[PDB]
Amino acid sequence: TPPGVVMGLAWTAMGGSTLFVETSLRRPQDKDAKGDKDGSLEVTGQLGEV
Amino acid sequence: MKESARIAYTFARAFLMQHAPANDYLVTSHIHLHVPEGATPKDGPSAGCT
Incomplete structure (x- = not known):
């Protein structure tokens, strides 16, 4: 677990x-x-809507 | 592609400092660039090393 990663349980469809x-x-x-410009996040991994 | 390009510019400046310290173009010289189009964006960073 190098810093910047964390484990998490997930209920996948099966x-x-x-x-x-x-x-x-x-x-x-x-x-x-x-620079004051914000660090906007950019998610990846096929985000839906929610 | 712009993220790959800014990363390319940054690593180019740093590598030029590591290798040819006397050289001063990239640190203080504007540079137009052009990448021919056609490739699909998902593979588009493939040219970044180029």
């Missing part, structure tokens, strides 16, 4: 299962060291 959800940086923070 049976239970153990996900390891992944979370990590996608692009270096330094647009500029003074």
Whole structure:
């Protein structure tokens, strides 16, 4: 479990299962060291609506 | 592709600093670029190493 990943139970449509959800940086923070622009998240893994 | 491109620009600047410290183009020079279209976006970062 390297930092930035955590395990989690999930009720998949057939049976239970153990996900390891992944979370990590996608692009270096330094647009500029003074930058106030927000780090909008960008999920992946075939999100639906909810 | 823009994320791949900004990552490419960043690693290019860093690698040029690691390899040719005297060189100063990428750190302080605007650069137009063009990638011919046609490839599907899901494979689109395939050219990023290029």
